[PDB]
Amino acid sequence: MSANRRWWVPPDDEDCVSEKLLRKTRESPLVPIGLGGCLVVAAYRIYRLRSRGSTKMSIHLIHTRVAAQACAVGAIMLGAVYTMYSDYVKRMAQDAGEK
């Protein structure tokens, strides 16, 4: 015991897949996992958008807990989701609409 000790600083953009997401995955569909993350995300969304909580002591929105968590998590989750929801497309050559 000295002072936390241990540290790390990856070059990649705050990591991405790696063995982490490698084991994280599984097989289950996104319909479920997604839906859930939708209720959570959306929830957190409507929350931030709306003015609820009843605290009156946070006119910064940065040094929080559930907010910061929703920010980070939300970022990850969302990011992933988006990538998926969008990836849903065939795979490439998205030339929709006719001019």
Closest CA to 73 of 35, 45, 32: 45
Instruction: Write the single-letter amino acid at 81.
Output: V
Question: What tokens does 52 get?
Answer: 């609820």
CA distance 8 to 28: 31
Rg of the chain on CA atoms, in Å: 18
What does the alpha-carbon distance between residue 41 and residue 45 come to, in Å, rounded to a whole number? 6
DSSP label of 49: H
* Experimental method of this PDB entry: NMR
Tell me the fold of 28-92: Helix Hairpins (6.10.140)
Q: Which two tokens stand for residue 62?
A: 């940065």
